[PDB]
Design a protein around this ligand. Structure first.
Ligand SMILES: Nc1ncnc2c1ncn2[C@@H]1O[C@H](CSCC[C@H](N)C(=O)O)[C@@H](O)[C@H]1O
Ligand SMILES: Nc1ncnc2c1ncn2[C@@H]1O[C@H](CSCC[C@H](N)C(=O)O)[C@@H](O)[C@H]1O
Ligand SMILES: COc1cc2c(cc1O)[C@@H]1Cc3ccc(OC)c(O)c3CN1CC2
Ligand SMILES: COc1cc2c(cc1O)[C@@H]1Cc3ccc(OC)c(O)c3CN1CC2
Lengths: 343, 346
């Protein structure tokens, strides 16, 4: 047995912390500004606010780990290593509208989240334990209420993810056309509705959320914010959007959310669910796209989990939606329609 | 707009999957702490157990334990740490066999539990400060004290056990290649940990008198290895008089100036014919996705976050240390996958 190189499994914790450091140092935007280029650490440090003469050697130590792990391209030239973007690190550069995966990556490796991960084994060992609650003494959404650093990191993570998800959704899914009104239950800071209205200008958007999220939201006109608790009830709605909400909750609570949605809808109204779906698993993007949020749910949320299409169908039917349709979008991302029948 | 067009159509969606990079080490940690790899190993390697079968060997009365464990293990399987078959059943792979204890109870588990310890990861949040600020040590900034002193007031155990397991593993490889211990009569291990290195050396060469030289809080843990006596001290003040010295995984903890001071103290403790035997991984000058590269880069980032100016070094840099410290002759013995023995001759 190669125990010696098995010691190298410690890279697994080194690599995400190296990536977090490079993200926080703005490395990817700095490289991107040089053109589709490979920059030395010294050249990158020219764009970092530091008075430290040793900054470039230290940065090289972080970046060469990212290069060996194929996050950055690396080649050695007359003045040492030089680093460029790759197909996988391009997502770390903000696009025309300033969205990248960076807010999501900074949230999911945030100290509060990682600290809770130390107790994920307790979900195996003890019935009904939530690692985040045990670590922090309150559930995640209450914590985000009390702690603005985590509130902000999480709200921006969800907003960036919303833009990314809906850019993919609109490549495939057409079911938002002919809708006149959409209430986003647990809609975050309203970015989801903003993307939808950007594509379908006549849809009236109502974002239904907790107050600490609404207070943190940008003023999107055309998005009206309503404070409330989805477990107590949902405002009257022609149609409802449920994105990245059901996976936060166990089956019982998900069914309760969906029953409140059913009660708020008129005959012929629809709940549109946007989630990743557990693939039928391997070293591929679909698998990681479901398993990554699943482990985040396991550490953060009350019985939240990712689900198969069959499990989503079961939730819908148990909550009063006898008509369901499933729309694979991309790499495990799905849109699903839960329809309340017309006469 | 042509420059920004390069971000139009980027697969941001699967880029969200980069969060798996932090999920994976925490899943692995959990599996280690639940004893998953030994439980699977008991089924005969190559055999696959369901999470229900594994949970049957874990002390819990939680009826949902198998589903929960499955959530951790399937992430490990998709990442090629475990093998999976579909419920799902899990087996060991070439990458996880090292997580099973050998004939002598040794595996990489103590090292993996140390390097993902809360204190270490907490310090990792400040590794960018080594870039931003002159002379800042992330562990010192995070916790208010240096790593070895912190271990003094106490993790002394987690780290010391990690180094001991790593020592057994390293010397099992060294003894396949390096023969330079065979004719020594006495060896002082400067910074020798809990003494496991000397214990392995004396097990192979029983006529070697072993002297383990360490900080007092490290010796407090040390087992009574035959042939090994423990001495407390500070290597920056001096080293006990020694016919030969072992320096394993010590130089890489320190910047050039302090490493040279260590080696000069070694020089002063040695007779005219004494040697320092250095055991370290060697940093390749051309890096890639290979074991040599990762075997140097992994401890290098741990040094960056934990230690005062510690770093991994090339062979040329080790020769430079030796020369600056008064050792005119050096010899290099590649062992395996970047691990080296080097002899510094006075
Ligand atoms: N009881 C409750 N009532 C309404 N919203 C709730 C709630 N409990 C949690 N939430 C909200 O549920 C959201 C889940 S995160 C998903 C946010 C958004 N739908 C997106 O896809 O980007 C959080 O914003 C949180 O504030
Ligand atoms: N001033 C000092 N004097 C003696 N030992 C010291 C020291 N500062 C740090 N050390 C020791 O240096 C060791 C580095 S870790 C290496 C341990 C061991 N040689 C092995 O290879 O497994 C630690 O055990 C630490 O206690
Ligand atoms: C190939 O993979 C690995 C290689 C090595 C180590 C850990 C690995 O996972 C450890 C990590 C470590 C951390 C802190 C130390 O002092 C504070 C220290 O001496 C070491 C030793 N090194 C030896 C090389
Ligand atoms: C494919 O990669 C990813 C996919 C997804 C998420 C993060 C990823 O990295 C996030 C993580 C997350 C964490 C906490 C939440 O509430 C507490 C939450 O709704 C989500 C949502 N999901 C959406 C799917």
């Amino acid at each position: 047995v190669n125990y010696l190189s098995g010691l190298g499994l410690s890279r697994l914790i080194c690599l995400p912390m190296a990536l977090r450091a490079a993200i926080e140092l703005n490395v990817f935007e700095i490289i991107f500004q040089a053109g589709p280029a490979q920059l030395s650490p010294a050249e990158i440090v020219a764009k970092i606010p530091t008075k430290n003469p040793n900054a470039a050697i230290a940065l090289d130590r972080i970046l060469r780990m990212l290069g060996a792990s194929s996050i950055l391209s690396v080649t050695t030239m007359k003045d040492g290593r030089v680093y460029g973007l790759t197909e996988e690190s391009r997502c770390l550069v903000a696009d025309k509208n300033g969205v990248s995966v960076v807010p999501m990556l900074l949230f999911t490796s945030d100290k509060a989240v990682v600290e809770s991960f130390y107790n994920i084994k307790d979900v195996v060992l003890e019935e009904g334990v939530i690692p985040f609650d045990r670590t922090h003494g309150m559930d995640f959404f209450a914590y985000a209420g009390k702690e603005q650093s985590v509130n902000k990191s999480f709200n921006q993570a969800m907003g960036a993810g919303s833009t990314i998800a809906f850019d993919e959704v609109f490549k495939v899914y057409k079911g938002f056309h002919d809708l006149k009104e959409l209430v986003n239950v647990g809609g975050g800071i309203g970015t989801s509705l903003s993307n939808i209205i950007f594509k379908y200008p006549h849809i009236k958007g109502i974002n239904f959320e907790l107050p600490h999220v609404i207070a943190d939201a940008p003023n999107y006109p055309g998005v009206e914010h309503i404070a409330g608790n989805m477990f107590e009830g949902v405002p009257n709605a022609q149609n409802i959007l449920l994105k990245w909400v059901l996976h936060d909750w166990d089956d019982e609570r998900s069914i309760k959310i969906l029953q409140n949605c059913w009660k708020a809808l008129p005959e012929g109204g629809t709940v549109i669910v946007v989630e990743f779906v557990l693939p039928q698993l391997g070293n591929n993007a679909e698998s990681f796209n479901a398993l990554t949020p699943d482990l985040l749910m396991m550490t953060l949320n009350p019985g939240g989990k990712e689900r198969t299409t069959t499990e989503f169908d079961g939730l819908a039917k148990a909550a009063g939606f006898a008509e369901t349709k499933f729309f694979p979008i991309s790499q495990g991302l799905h849109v699903m329609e839960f329809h309340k029948a017309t006469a």
